[PDB]
Amino acid sequence: GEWTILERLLEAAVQQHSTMIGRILLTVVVIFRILIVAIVGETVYDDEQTMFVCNTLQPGCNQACYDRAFPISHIRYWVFQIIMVCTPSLCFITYSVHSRFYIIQVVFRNALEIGFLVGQYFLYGFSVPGLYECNRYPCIKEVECYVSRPTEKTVFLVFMFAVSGICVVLNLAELNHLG
Amino acid sequence: GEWTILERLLEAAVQQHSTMIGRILLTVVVIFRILIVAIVGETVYDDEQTMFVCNTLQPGCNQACYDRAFPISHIRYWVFQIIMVCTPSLCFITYSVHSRFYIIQVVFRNALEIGFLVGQYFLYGFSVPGLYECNRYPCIKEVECYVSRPTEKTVFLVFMFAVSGICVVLNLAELNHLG
Amino acid sequence: GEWTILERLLEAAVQQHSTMIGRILLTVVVIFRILIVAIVGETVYDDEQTMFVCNTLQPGCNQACYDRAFPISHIRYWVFQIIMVCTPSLCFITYSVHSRFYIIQVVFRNALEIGFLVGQYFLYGFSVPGLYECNRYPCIKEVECYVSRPTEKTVFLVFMFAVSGICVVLNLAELNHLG
Amino acid sequence: GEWTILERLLEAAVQQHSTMIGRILLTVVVIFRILIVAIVGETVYDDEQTMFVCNTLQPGCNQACYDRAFPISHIRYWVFQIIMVCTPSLCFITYSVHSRFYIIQVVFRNALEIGFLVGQYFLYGFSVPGLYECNRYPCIKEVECYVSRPTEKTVFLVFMFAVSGICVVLNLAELNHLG
Amino acid sequence: GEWTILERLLEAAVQQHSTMIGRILLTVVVIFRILIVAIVGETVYDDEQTMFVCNTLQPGCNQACYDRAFPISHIRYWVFQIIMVCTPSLCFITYSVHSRFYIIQVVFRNALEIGFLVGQYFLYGFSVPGLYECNRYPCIKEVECYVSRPTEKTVFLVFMFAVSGICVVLNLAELNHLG
Amino acid sequence: GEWTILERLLEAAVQQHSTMIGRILLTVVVIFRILIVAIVGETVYDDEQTMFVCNTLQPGCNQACYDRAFPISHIRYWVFQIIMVCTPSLCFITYSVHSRFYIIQVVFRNALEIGFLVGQYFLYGFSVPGLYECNRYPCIKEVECYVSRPTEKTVFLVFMFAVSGICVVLNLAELNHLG
Amino acid sequence: GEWTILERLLEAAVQQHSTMIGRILLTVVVIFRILIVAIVGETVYDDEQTMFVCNTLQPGCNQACYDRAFPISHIRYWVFQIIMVCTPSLCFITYSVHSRFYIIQVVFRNALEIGFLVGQYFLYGFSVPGLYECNRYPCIKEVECYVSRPTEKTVFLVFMFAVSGICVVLNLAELNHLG
Amino acid sequence: GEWTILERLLEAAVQQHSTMIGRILLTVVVIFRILIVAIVGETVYDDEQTMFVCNTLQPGCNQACYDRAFPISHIRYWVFQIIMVCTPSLCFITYSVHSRFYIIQVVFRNALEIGFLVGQYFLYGFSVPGLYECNRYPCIKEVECYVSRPTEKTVFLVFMFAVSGICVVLNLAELNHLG
Amino acid sequence: GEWTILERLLEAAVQQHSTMIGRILLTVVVIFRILIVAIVGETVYDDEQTMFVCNTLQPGCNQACYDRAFPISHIRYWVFQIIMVCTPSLCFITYSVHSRFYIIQVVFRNALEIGFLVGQYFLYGFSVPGLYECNRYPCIKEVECYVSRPTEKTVFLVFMFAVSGICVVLNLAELNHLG
Numbered sequence A, B, C, D, E, F, G, H, I: 001g002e003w004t005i006l007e008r009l010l011e012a013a014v015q016q017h018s019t020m021i022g023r024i025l026l027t028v029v030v031i032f033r034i035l036i037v038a039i040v041g042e043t044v045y046d047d048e049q050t051m052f053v054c055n056t057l058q059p060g061c062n063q064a065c066y067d068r069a070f071p072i073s074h075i076r077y078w079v080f081q082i083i084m085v086c087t088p089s090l091c092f093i094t095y096s097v098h099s100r101f102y103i104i105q106v107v108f109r110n111a112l113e114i115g116f117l118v119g120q121y122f123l124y125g126f127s128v129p130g131l132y133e134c135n136r137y138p139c140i141k142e143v144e145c146y147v148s149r150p151t152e153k154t155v156f157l158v159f160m161f162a163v164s165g166i167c168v169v170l171n172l173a174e175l176n177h178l179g
């Protein structure tokens, strides 16, 4: 992934006036989200489908049950969330050199943070179990499948949920501050 | 992929005078297309032929049915589209330092955007199913094949179609603005 | 891993006034931790699950016993520790350009160093043996499993424990210096 | 490996006053060690365990005999040696901007060079044979194993020993020069 | 099978006085039962467990589901029935050379014929299907298994049931004849 | 197969008065049917299911398509026909020692010969092809299967049909002779 | 097995004077033991070691656990018992043509019948389970193994125990008769 | 094969008056044909299709090329020839107990011997080579196949041709003797 | 094995005058040797080389170590011994119909019995262990191999040694009787 283009864009997008809460929120976003996703998370989800196995002899059942158990990977959801959260801060380049803008940005950023947090709760939950039960064609009746590295993905889920809750609390604090 | 050469060329190609609609179009192109293709999309289509399987014993039938089901990969079509869309904006370097030019650029950019959107509709459609039916030599009669990660590629297709429709609407808005 | 973003952040975060002990601690952190993790350690833990084998015919027992023997990889724990240790020094950017701060930073850095050292002692220990005994479902009764590169991971464990003990001694020396 | 961080640190660490012998030693270190390890040596030791085979049917005997024959890889020992040798020259950044220092640096650098040369002689020797005899559990009695690319690793061993002997001779020449 | 010992015993056991119905019953028994079992039936049930397959990867599930689907083979039940039916006629050798005996023999032969016919109805039924559903340990949940030569074993079942019904009708005819 | 019991029964069953046509029919039956089935035919149909293959990866499709292509083996049909044809001649033992009988025997033997000849025509035909097309569950759509020793089974079919036609012509000749 | 030599020897050994109980015992021995072992039992124990499987990857563990679970096959024990029981009746040929002898024969036959019945109880028991637990070298710790055709061997065990108990009761009846 | 039925039939068929040449012909037939086919030849052609291999990956090509190279096995042709040659001598049982007959028998026996000798020359030839070239569907273009035990089948072919030529010479000698 | 030819020869060879000890010896030979070898022993040694395995990857090492561990099978040694022991009793047919002969026969029979008993002690011993150690070419150094059915072959060895010792004691008793 070409993270240096996003780095240079975020360097040119952090020149806008911000409050204390906004700078604490940017510090949490830079440290607890970007460096961890861009350094640690890529290799964890590397052998997700290679080391996914099911107890059957039916061709094509592994693909069906893997696609049914993990519709979207965690890492790609987090990368999309990171890109979308910083979008309101990237519209400053277009709107500047070319206080209502600040309020609109804050409102949109709060709505995005809450939407992504709720979507993360509904998509995944709080844990990744080590077994899965599958009843999708072409598999015959119900079969059982086994997952790769479930403990380290439960740890990743819990850590990301905690960081997103912190950023949501700071967003609501600043929203109350504006009034 | 060497995306930093395109970055430096687009940095030297965005010095041309543009309208408000043109800057909104460039912002949508930079955010919703380049960062997602250059960060997220490369790894999704990595095991497309390795995890493609068919129910047969005939040598060479997997290659024939994979080539018949996916004549061109989605990711390479999107990269070519990204390069071609920014071509009219890259001819400014040749035509400058060396308002009719602006109008010609707008006309060509609208024609390219509509051509690629229609070609994307005719090549792929709106969904990627999880099964395929193949009747190509050397396969005997019709055989059935199974696809890798179909839900996340339906999600990618829908997202790209929405972004291309937004950029087409802005292109027609600016075309009407010029008159 | 994108270590150059952390490099540029640590270049912009080392402009704070520091004592002699703090500069010796930063030199030990830069040399004995970052260059070794960022150059040497990545390739050692590359085939940890591919070259992990157990003596059984049960599908899914390799995944269960590998997840039970190594809940979190050493390399990811060390990367997270490196990021967290430098966090108090990365809050200077937010708190500066925007002596109590120095004392609070020292207290938090000492607490983090001791917490990570104790957690490393409780998670892993001092050696990595070459055999493992597993009694987790779906494995039948107890089975025996064999580990990849155990001597070079015992060497890595001992080296990291020695460096962390040195940095803890310097942190307590500076804490006594402040009084 | 992130060799550009070490490059930038060595660029900022070569601003210290040095003698003629010290500059010849730095030239030999830069050319005959860093460029060869950082360009040529990484790919040679890539399939060391994949292309290591033994004549047996016992599960887990390949891991035991590979770990017994190569406790530490040559390439990682050389990288650690390169980092440690340049450490005395990297303490100048801390000790400068913040002739006894020069003498202490020379003494420590000579001790490190001799220690690593003797350790390299005792760990490996002068050649890498193409056969190995193993009598480690779980292997039954003694078994025979075959090695990958032994001639090119004997060539690498001899070349590195010659370069280290040259740098040791220059270190003792400068030590005599100081008196 | 040593059928010639039974042949010589039945040659020495058919010297007893019998009625017309008893000789018709012996003719049906000799032709429609002994020659067909002793010539045709042995090879049909030769690959019953070798060509029995189930859709699973679990060791030991084939043995469990084959033992659950066919507790006793058809051919061995028929051989035991043939031996037991001729037992009352083989007690004449002991009771002769050494009309109440004739009546007791007829009563016992009728009871045996009806018992075996009812047991054959309850054990097997009228058809052998080509699929089986198994939920026995160590198989996980329910699995599906496929049978070898089901049409020719349905034909064998129907033929044997018809012959046994004919012999039962003749036994009841003679029982009524005695009064 | 225990053919010597049938031999001894046919030796004790050929003591009945017969015409010239009946003795020619018995000679054709003894030579062209019993010796060939009892010597030559057993080994030809030994590997019928072992050397039967289909082009698929579906478990259980070989059993389904083999059972659909050969509901009853040729050799077992011929053995049953041989036993049934000689049945009217085996009722002489019961009816003798214990000319209307001769006429009834001739009528029943002609009816059996014609019934078996017509059934052989409808079951099999005149040739055994080397390919088969199968569309039975669990096979997906239509698959193609290959047969073992088809030329030698076409030769066997033609030879048996010719011999049965000769015996039918002699049976009708004797039936006309009686009037 | 050459059962016709034993047949001819038992034909020449049954010319001795015997009582009513002795003839009933010989009838039970001839029918319920010899014909069933010589016709039915040989094929049941044909694939005992081929269809015996264990859940392991260790070479040589199948042989060790099969030899530990079935030290002597049931069928060979029954054949030896049949030969030994008829031995006292086969010494009449030597002692005749060449009432104390009759009494000695009865005493020895009763002792043999009781010894074999008790040995059968202690060797096997009353049932054959479908699972076995093995802890014999070279198997690692305890492993689990699966048995072939356990229900039909429990049926065989029960039938043989019932017949042996009947023959023991008749032997003790005749022993009391002699006084 | 049940050769004892043919033995007993040939014992009852050699009671006809014969000349010296006819008895020499019967001696050659009994010794050089029946004992060798009935003792030696059965096991040679046992693994003809199991040990027949071709250099391809196409399913079903082995069956096609084996059926094309050996339309009828040598051993079955020889058994049929043996049965047919003795047929004229087996019609004596029907024609006797029930010199023109002798002449008709001699004429038919000579015609059969010459027909079978010429058919053996045209079907097979004089040698069995060790390679075969096959261009039959489903094989792609021409493929090469390898034969099992070719030298011992060339020896068998030559021996049988010599014996058949001797019997043909004796048949023509006796035909000339009759005139 | 054609044991009925030996049966008929031993029936025609037991017409010679013999003493009481000679008839007891013939009874022990007929019962405890011929019926057990001809009924029980053939199937025990059926899978001796198929179920013999060694822990290696070297082609041809199984054949070498099996031939080194079992130079001659037990069953073939016992069959040869049975044939040779009865040879002196088979020379009576030649020497009769065509008391010094009796003495010479007794002397030769005693010498043969003692020679075979001593040879059996030196060839095999008293037990068959379950492991074997092999150091024969092409095996590399020493390897370990595992044996099939060792307990039932130790039982067979002990039983045969006991019977041979009984027959040797009776032979020496009769030798002393002659004087």
Ligand SMILES: CC(C)CCC[C@@H](C)[C@H]1CC[C@H]2[C@@H]3CC=C4C[C@@H](OC(=O)CCC(=O)O)CC[C@]4(C)[C@H]3CC[C@]12C
Pocket (backbone or CB within 6 Å): A084, A087, A088, A091, A100, A101, A104, A105, A108, A112
């Ligand atoms: C996360 C995905 C699924 C939807 C992403 C939608 C974005 C494309 C949204 C989120 C932030 C939104 C922007 C937030 C702020 C505004 C400012 C608004 O203009 C101003 O505040 C300045 C001019 C004025 O004062 O009216 C125009 C719309 C815009 C750009 C919004 C348009 C819709 C945006 C770009």
Ligand SMILES: CC(C)CCC[C@@H](C)[C@H]1CC[C@H]2[C@@H]3CC=C4C[C@@H](OC(=O)CCC(=O)O)CC[C@]4(C)[C@H]3CC[C@]12C
Pocket (backbone or CB within 6 Å): B084, B087, B088, B091, B100, B101, B104, B105, B108, B112
């Ligand atoms: C997407 C693929 C399949 C075709 C790509 C074709 C391009 C090579 C096209 C699209 C944009 C086009 C250019 C758009 C604008 C013009 C300007 C035109 O010149 C001017 O407007 C300036 C001089 C003048 O005023 O006449 C000369 C042709 C050119 C470069 C066009 C030539 C053909 C181009 C390069």
Ligand SMILES: CC(C)CCC[C@@H](C)[C@H]1CC[C@H]2[C@@H]3CC=C4C[C@@H](OC(=O)CCC(=O)O)CC[C@]4(C)[C@H]3CC[C@]12C
Pocket (backbone or CB within 6 Å): C084, C087, C088, C091, C100, C101, C104, C105, C108, C112
């Ligand atoms: C390692 C993981 C599991 C927890 C990481 C928690 C961090 C997010 C902690 C460790 C360092 C802490 C900071 C260390 C120093 C302080 C300074 C404190 O403010 C000051 O010293 C300046 C203003 C003043 O003088 O009060 C406010 C809290 C803060 C940022 C702390 C908040 C909590 C932080 C960021």
Ligand SMILES: CC(C)CCC[C@@H](C)[C@H]1CC[C@H]2[C@@H]3CC=C4C[C@@H](OC(=O)CCC(=O)O)CC[C@]4(C)[C@H]3CC[C@]12C
Pocket (backbone or CB within 6 Å): D084, D087, D088, D091, D100, D101, D104, D105, D108, D112
């Ligand atoms: C290779 C591994 C196994 C051990 C690496 C140990 C290093 C951490 C050693 C080697 C070089 C040593 C340094 C070489 C020079 C000196 C200078 C000495 O101070 C001075 O010369 C300046 C002040 C003065 O003049 O006293 C303080 C110790 C120090 C940093 C040494 C401390 C121990 C160091 C850092």
Ligand SMILES: CC(C)CCC[C@@H](C)[C@H]1CC[C@H]2[C@@H]3CC=C4C[C@@H](OC(=O)CCC(=O)O)CC[C@]4(C)[C@H]3CC[C@]12C
Pocket (backbone or CB within 6 Å): E084, E087, E088, E091, E100, E101, E104, E105, E108, E112
């Ligand atoms: C099929 C299996 C499960 C049970 C087999 C039981 C047999 C052992 C049965 C069936 C036939 C029975 C026999 C049928 C006839 C009689 C005759 C009866 O004696 C007489 O009729 C003659 C003396 C008299 O007139 O009393 C003594 C019992 C006996 C042998 C019966 C005893 C029990 C037998 C042998």
Ligand SMILES: CC(C)CCC[C@@H](C)[C@H]1CC[C@H]2[C@@H]3CC=C4C[C@@H](OC(=O)CCC(=O)O)CC[C@]4(C)[C@H]3CC[C@]12C
Pocket (backbone or CB within 6 Å): F084, F087, F088, F091, F100, F101, F104, F105, F108, F112
């Ligand atoms: C081939 C299969 C499917 C059916 C086999 C049916 C047989 C059991 C048939 C064919 C020959 C038939 C027999 C042919 C001749 C007669 C003679 C008939 O009696 C007599 O001719 C003698 C007494 C008299 O003169 O009436 C009684 C029926 C019976 C035995 C027939 C009964 C039915 C039989 C046995």
Ligand SMILES: CC(C)CCC[C@@H](C)[C@H]1CC[C@H]2[C@@H]3CC=C4C[C@@H](OC(=O)CCC(=O)O)CC[C@]4(C)[C@H]3CC[C@]12C
Pocket (backbone or CB within 6 Å): G084, G087, G088, G091, G100, G101, G104, G105, G108, G112
């Ligand atoms: C089942 C296995 C383990 C041991 C088999 C031992 C046999 C060899 C036993 C069982 C029956 C026994 C025989 C039973 C009867 C007698 C009769 C006895 O002589 C007589 O009764 C007749 C002369 C006399 O009246 O003394 C001599 C011993 C002998 C043959 C016994 C010797 C030992 C025998 C042969």
Ligand SMILES: CC(C)CCC[C@@H](C)[C@H]1CC[C@H]2[C@@H]3CC=C4C[C@@H](OC(=O)CCC(=O)O)CC[C@]4(C)[C@H]3CC[C@]12C
Pocket (backbone or CB within 6 Å): H084, H087, H088, H091, H100, H101, H104, H105, H108, H112
């Ligand atoms: C080898 C296969 C392909 C054909 C086998 C045909 C047989 C069935 C042939 C060969 C010998 C032939 C027989 C040879 C001798 C004669 C004698 C002939 O009658 C006599 O010689 C006696 C009465 C008389 O003198 O006319 C009637 C035909 C018959 C049986 C022939 C009929 C046709 C037979 C049986």
Ligand SMILES: CC(C)CCC[C@@H](C)[C@H]1CC[C@H]2[C@@H]3CC=C4C[C@@H](OC(=O)CCC(=O)O)CC[C@]4(C)[C@H]3CC[C@]12C
Pocket (backbone or CB within 6 Å): I084, I087, I088, I091, I100, I101, I104, I105, I108, I112
């Ligand atoms: C077991 C194998 C390895 C050697 C087998 C050798 C046999 C072929 C031996 C054992 C018994 C021997 C026979 C035992 C008895 C004698 C009798 C002897 O003649 C007589 O006693 C009758 C005439 C006379 O009184 O001299 C001639 C040799 C011969 C047949 C012996 C010749 C050698 C024989 C056949």
